Chain length 496, copies 3
C-alpha cells in the first residue's frame, strides 16, 4: 500500500509554504488575498458564468441527446429508486451550508443587486429568489455531465478511477496521463481541493464554537477555534485508527435526520403559510430573472454583487464538481443517462431549496421583527455570532440550540473523516476502491486541512475564504472541462 | 324519472340554511364573508396558483405525451374542424364576462401590481397584459387535462357520466363511488356549483338593470334587481314548460352574433391602430411577466393584488372546470388528444383575448380622456353604473346601449335556462343524457339560484361574490384532481 | 441582350419624378416626409413587428418541420462548411453598418426605452443589449424562410429566377406572373429597392467625406458629398467598362480583412475584459427583455423609441430580405433545410454581434470618459461628424483613421458596383445569370442611385433616410409574403 510521491509531496509542500508564508504576516497576506480576489473576479468572473451556462446547455444535450436512453452499465440498479433519491437528499447537508443558508439572504437585502434600494420591500421579495438561483436545479444540472462521464467510465468502460488523470488517456494518450501532464493535473486538482476542504472547515468551526459560547459561556476565541480543530483531528484519528467507521455511518444518518428535524422545526414555528406564499412568489422571480442572473456582471454600476456572490459561488461549485459527480455516479449504477439527469436535479434541489427557504425566511422574519440588529452584531462580533442569534431567537431556544450544536458537531466530524479518506486516497498508489488507506497518511492530511482552516480563521473575514475558493476553481475550470472532453472523445468511438 | 334524494336534498337544505342565515343579518354576514375571504386567500391562495401551474405542465404531458396521438373514440368527428372551433369561440360569451371585461383593467391601473404607481403610464402599459394573463391561453390550457379525461371516459370507455362520482370507480372502487363517498363528492360539487351559478347571475343582473335605467329612467334598486330575477325565472318556466327549447337555441345564436357585432363596433370606433399597437405591446408584457405572475403572492408589501384577483379568479376557474371539460369533450368526439389541446386553447383564447382587449382599451381610452370619472361613479353608485357609462360614452350611444341591453338580456336567459337543466340533471336519477328532466325539479332550481344572486346583490359589494367563489373552489380543488387521477389510473390499464 | 421596358421604365420615371419633385422644394418635401414616417409607423408599425415574429416562428417550422432533413438539390455542396460560413461572415460588412454600429448605442442611452432615465447607468447596461436584439440571431432567422424558398426554387425545381414574379407562377398562375400583375410586383419591388440602395449610399457618403476632412482638412460640404458620388460612379463606369471585375473581387476581400482588422484593433485597445463582461451582461438582458422588445410599441407614454428604431429597422430588413435570401441560397447549394437555418444564423450573427459590441462599447466608453461631447457635436455638425470623432479618439488616431477611410472607401465602391449589376440585371430581358449586363443600363442606374443619395443628403437629417426605407418596406411586406406563400403552394405538391 504505497504512498505515491508525485501526488503526495507537491501538495504537502505547496500547502505548507503558502500556509507558512501566510502565518508569517497576516496583514500583508490579506492585502495579497484582496488583490487576487478582485483581479480574478473583476477580470475573469464572466468566464465562470459562461462555464455554468455551457454545462447547462449540455444537461439538455444529455437529456434530449443520443446517449439519452443509453443505460449506465448492463446490470440492474442496486438501489430502490426511492432509496437512491433519499441518498442524494441526504448528502447535501454540510456544516458550511447551514452557514450560508442562514445569512446570505441578509446581504441580499442589505446590499441588493440590480441597483435596488436596501431593505426595501423590493430587495426583500427578491432575496430568497436569489437563494433559489444559487442553489437551484440550475446549478445541480451542471453536474450531470460529469456525473454521466464518471458513470460511463465506471461501468460502460469498467475503468478504475482514483484521480482525474486516470480518465484522461483518450484525450491525451496513455503516454501523457500516466506521465507528468497527468501528475500536474492531479496536483493542481488536489491543492485546489485541499483549500476548499479547509475553507469549508473554517465556516463550520465558528458555528460550532459560537454555539458552545451560547449554551455554555466559553468565549469564542481563536485559541479555542483551534482547540476544536485538534479535537476533531484527535477524534478523527481515534475513529479511523479503531476501524470504527462502522458506527460513523450510523452517526452520519443521525445527522441527516436531525437536520430534517431541525429544518422541519424552523418551518412550522416560523409560519408555514408565509413560507409557502414566500416560496411561491420567489419561484416566479427566479423564473423571470433567471436569464438576467445567469449572466450578471454589473459592469456599469460596478457594484460587486455578481463577482462577490455568483462568481465566488460558481467557482466553489467548479471545485467540488468532480468529487460529487463521482458519488452521483456510484449510487447510480445501471440507470439511463436521462434517468440520472432528471433524478439528480429533482433530488438534490429538493434538498437545497428546502433548507435555504426555511432558514432564509426565518432570518428574514427576524429582520422585519427587529428582534435583533444583525448588522451591529456582525460589526462587533463577526458573521457567525449573528447566525447563532437567529437560531436562538427561536422558541425553546436552549433545546433548539442543542439541536444545532449537535448537528454542526456530528456533521463536521463526518466532514473531516471524509476529507481525510478522500485525500489520503488520491495520494496513495496501488489502493483498491472501497479500501481503507494508511492511517498515517490519512490522519496526516486531517492535520494539514485543520491547519488551513485556522489560517483562514486567523486571517479574519470572508475575503480569505472566497479568495481561497475562487483561486481553487481556476485550474479546475480546465480540469473539469478536460475530464468532460475526455469522456466525449472516448464515447464517440466506444458507446455507439 | 326519479329525483334521487342523496343528490337533491343536501344541496337544497344547505343552500337554504346558509341563504337564510345570511338574509337574517346582512351586516354580520358580511363580517363573516370578509373573514373567510381573507383567510383562504392569504393563507392558502398559493396552492391555487400551484394547481393551475401543474395542470399547465400536464397540457404539455398531453401534447408531447404518450396519449398524444391517441384518438378520442373510433368514429370520425361529427363536426367540421371550423364548425368545431366556432362552437368554442361562441360558448365564451357570458353576461358576467361583459362585466369583468369592461371594468377590470381600471383596477389594474387604479391599484396596480408589483408596487406600481397608479394611473402611471407604467401601470397602464401593464393593464391589458394582466387581462391577457387571466384569460389567456395559459388558463384554458388547464382544462385540456379534464377535457381529455371526459373525452376518454365518454368514448374510449363508452362510459355514461352525469355526476363527478360516476367517473371515480377506478380510483376508489365501484363500492365507494356508488356509495356515500361519491355522494359527498357529488354534493360538495353541486353546492359549490350552485353558488357560482348564482354569483354569475348577481353580476349579470345590475348590468341588465343599469341598462334599463339608462335607456328608460327606471331607478336601479334592489326591489328591481329581484323583480327581474323573477321574470327570468318566469320566462324560464314558460320556455321549458312549453318544450320551446327549439327556439332558445336560435336566440342563443342571435346572442353570439350580437356580441361579435358589438365587440366589432367598439373595436373600429375606438381606433384599431391603437388597439393593435396596444394589443401587441401587451403580448410582450405577458410574455415577459408571465412567470412572475404565474406565482405572484406579494408577500412583503402585502398588497392584496394576487389574492384579490388571481386567487379569486383561479378559484372561479376550478369550479366551472368540470362543466366545460365535459362540453369540450362532447363537441370533440373522434379527435386526437393533441388535436384537442391545440384546438381548445387556440379557439377559446381567440374568443377571450378579443373581448377584453376591446372593452378594456375602450374603458382605458375613456380613462385617458377624462370623459368620465369612473372612481367617483363607482363610489356613489356601484361598479355596474360605471360599466354602463363606459358603453354609453360611445358614439350612437342609445343604439349602442340597446345592443348591450339585448345582449345582456338574451344572454342571461340562456344562462338561467342552462343552470337549471344542468342542476336538475345532476340531481335526478335514471335520466338519459340529452333528455329533458322533470319541469318541477328544473324550474325549482332556477328559483334557488335566483335567490342566491339577490342575497349577494343584497349583501352589497364584490366581496360576497368573490368569497362565494373562493369558498366554492375549495372542495373542487380536490374534486377536479380526483377526476383527473381517476382518469389516469384507468388509462394506465385500458388505453395502451 | 434586351432592355425589357415593363421593368425598366416605371422605375426610372417614378424615381425621377419623385426625386425631381423633392429637389424642387426641400422644406416642403421634409414636411411630407415627416408626415409619411409618423403615419406609417404610428398607425402600422405593429404589423411590421408581427411580420418578423411570424417568420421567426417558421424558422422553427423549418428546423423541426417536415422539410427539416430535405436536401437543397441532389449534388454535393460546392463549398467547405468553413468556406461557406466565412462567406456569410464576410458579406455583412457594409459602409452603412459602420454608421449605425458606431452611433446607435448613443441614442439608446441619450433617449432610452421603457421609460428609462437617460445616461443612467441603467439605460447604459441596456444599451448594447438593444444592439444585440436589432442585429442578433433573431432577425437573421427571419431570412431563412426565404433563403430556403430561393434555395428550393433554384435547385429542387431547377427554376431560373431573376425577378420576384418569376417565382409566383404557382401562387397566381403562369398567366398573371408573366402578365402585369407580376410586372407591378417587380416594379414596386425595384422602386423600393432603389431607394434603399440610395439611402445606404447616403449613410456611407458623409462617413467617407468626414474622414477626408479629418485627415486632410477639406470641408465636408454638400457640393463635396456630390463630388464623391460622381467619382464613385465614374470609378464604377471604368471598372465595369473594362471588364475589370476580376480585381474588384480582390479588393472586396481586402475590405473584409481590413474590417476584421479594424474591429480587432478597437477591441483590444479599448479593453477586452470590459467588452467581455459587457457582452456577457448584455446577452442576459437580451434574453430576458427579448419578448418585451419583440412586440414593443410604447402606446401609453408615446415615446417614439419602437417606431423610430425597431419599426424603421424591421422595414429596412423587409427590403434587403429577398436580395440576401437569394445569396444565401446560392452559396448554399446541396445542404439540408436545417443545415441552412442553423448555419446562416450562427454565421451572420457572429459577424453582426461582434461589430456592434465592439464599436458600441468604444463609443460607450468615450461617453463615460467625457473625452468628447457627442450631443454638441451632433448638434452643430451632424451625426457623421461625431461618429468620426469616436474613431479618432482612438490611439494612433491618424493611422486608425486611414484604416477606416480606406475601409469605407473600397467598401462603398463594392456597394455601388453591386447595386448597378443587380439593378441593371433585374431590368434587362433575356439575360443569363452570372452574365455581365449592358454597360449603358448598368452605369445608367449607378447615376440614378447616386442621385437619390444626394437628394437625401440634401434634405438633411435621418428622417428622410428612414422614411425612404419605411416607405420601401410597405410593398415588400406583401412581396416577401407572396414569394413565401408561392414557395409553399409549390412544395406542398412537388417536394414530398
Ligand atoms: C462582503 N460579502 C462577501 C459579505 C458580500 C460581498 C458582496 C459583493 O461582492 O458586493
Ligand atoms: C461549494 N458548496 C459547498 C457551497 C457547494 C458545493 C456543491 C456540493 O455541496 O455538492
Ligand atoms: C376590491 N376588489 C375586490 C374589486 C379588488 C380587490 C383588489 C385586491 O385583491 O386587493
Ligand atoms: C369563471 N369565468 C366566467 C370567469 C370563466 C369560466 C370559464 C367559462 O366561462 O367557461
Ligand atoms: C431621431 N433619431 C432617429 C436619431 C432618433 C429617433 C428616436 C425616436 O424615434 O424617438
Ligand atoms: C438594413 N441593413 C442594411 C442595415 C441590414 C440589411 C440586412 C443585411 O445586412 O443583409
Amino acid at each position: 500500500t504505497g504512498i505515491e510521491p508525485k501526488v503526495f509531496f507537491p501538495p504537502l509542500i505547496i500547502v505548507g509554504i503558502l500556509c507558512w508564508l501566510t502565518v508569517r504576516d497576516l496583514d500583508a497576506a490579506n492585502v495579497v488575498i484582496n488583490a487576487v480576489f478582485s483581479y480574478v473576479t473583476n477580470v475573469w468572473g464572466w468566464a465562470f458564468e459562461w462555464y455554468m451556462v455551457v454545462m447547462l446547455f449540455g444537461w439538455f444535450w444529455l437529456v434530449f441527446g443520443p446517449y439519452a436512453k443509453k443505460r449506465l452499465g448492463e446490470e440492474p440498479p442496486e438501489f430502490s429508486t426511492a432509496s437512491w433519491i433519499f441518498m442524494m437528499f441526504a448528502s447535501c447537508t454540510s456544516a458550511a451550508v447551514l452557514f450560508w443558508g442562514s445569512i446570505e439572504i441578509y446581504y441580499y437585502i442589505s446590499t441588493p443587486p440590480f441597483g435596488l434600494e436596501p431593505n426595501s420591500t423590493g430587495a426583500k421579495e427578491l432575496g430568497l429568489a436569489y437563494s433559489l438561483f444559487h442553489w437551484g436545479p440550475l446549478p445541480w444540472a451542471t453536474y450531470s455531465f460529469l456525473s454521466v462521464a464518471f458513470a460511463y467510465f465506471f461501468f460502460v468502460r469498467k475503468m478504475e478511477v482514483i484521480r482525474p488523470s486516470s480518465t484522461l488517456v483518450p484525450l491525451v494518450g496513455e503516454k501523457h496521463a500516466k506521465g507528468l501532464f497527468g501528475t500536474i493535473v492531479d496536483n493542481f486538482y488536489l491543492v485546489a481541493l485541499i483549500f476548499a476542504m479547509g475553507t469549508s472547515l473554517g465556516l463550520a468551526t465558528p458555528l460550532v464554537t459560537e454555539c458552545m459560547q451560547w449554551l455554555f459561556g466559553i468565549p469564542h476565541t481563536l485559541q479555542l477555534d483551534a482547540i476544536i480543530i485538534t479535537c476533531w483531528i484527535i477524534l478523527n484519528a481515534i475513529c479511523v485508527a479503531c476501524g470504527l467507521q462502522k458506527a460513523v455511518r450510523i452517526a452520519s444518518d443521525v445527522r441527516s435526520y436531525l437536520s430534517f428535524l431541525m429544518l422541519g422545526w424552523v418551518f412550522i414555528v416560523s409560519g408555514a403559510s408565509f413560507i409557502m406564499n414566500y416560496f411561491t412568489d420567489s419561484v416566479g422571480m427566479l423564473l423571470m430573472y433567471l436569464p438576467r442572473m445567469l449572466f450578471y456582471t454589473d459592469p456599469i454600476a460596478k457594484g460587486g454583487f455578481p463577482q462577490g456572490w455568483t462568481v465566488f459561488y460558481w467557482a466553489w461549485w467548479v471545485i467540488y464538481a468532480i468529487q460529487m459527480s463521482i458519488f452521483l455516479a456510484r449510487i447510480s449504477r445501471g440507470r439511463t443517462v436521462r434517468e440520472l439527469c432528471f433524478g439528480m436535479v429533482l433530488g438534490l434541489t429538493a434538498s437545497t431549496w428546502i433548507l435555504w427557504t426555511v432558514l432564509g425566511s426565518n432570518t428574514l422574519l427576524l429582520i422585519d421583527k427587529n428582534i435583533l440588529n444583525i448588522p451591529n452584531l456582525i460589526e462587533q462580533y463577526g458573521v457567525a455570532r449573528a447566525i447563532i442569534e437567529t437560531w436562538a431567537a427561536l422558541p425553546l431556544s436552549t433545546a433548539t440550540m442543542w439541536g444545532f450544536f449537535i448537528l454542526c458537531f456530528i456533521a463536521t466530524v463526518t466532514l473531516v473523516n471524509a476529507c481525510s479518506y478522500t485525500l489520503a486516497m488520491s495520494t496513495c498508489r496501488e489502493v483498491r476502491d472501497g479500501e481503507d488507506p494508511p492511517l498515517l497518511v490519512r490522519i496526516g492530511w486531517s492535520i494539514l486541512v485543520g491547519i488551513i482552516g485556522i489560517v483562514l480563521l486567523a486571517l479574519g473575514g470572508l475575503k480569505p475564504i472566497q479568495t481561497a475558493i475562487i483561486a481553487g476553481g481556476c485550474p479546475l475550470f480546465f480540469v473539469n472541462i478536460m475530464v468532460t472532453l475526455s469522456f466525449i472523445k472516448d464515447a464517440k468511438q466506444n458507446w455507439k
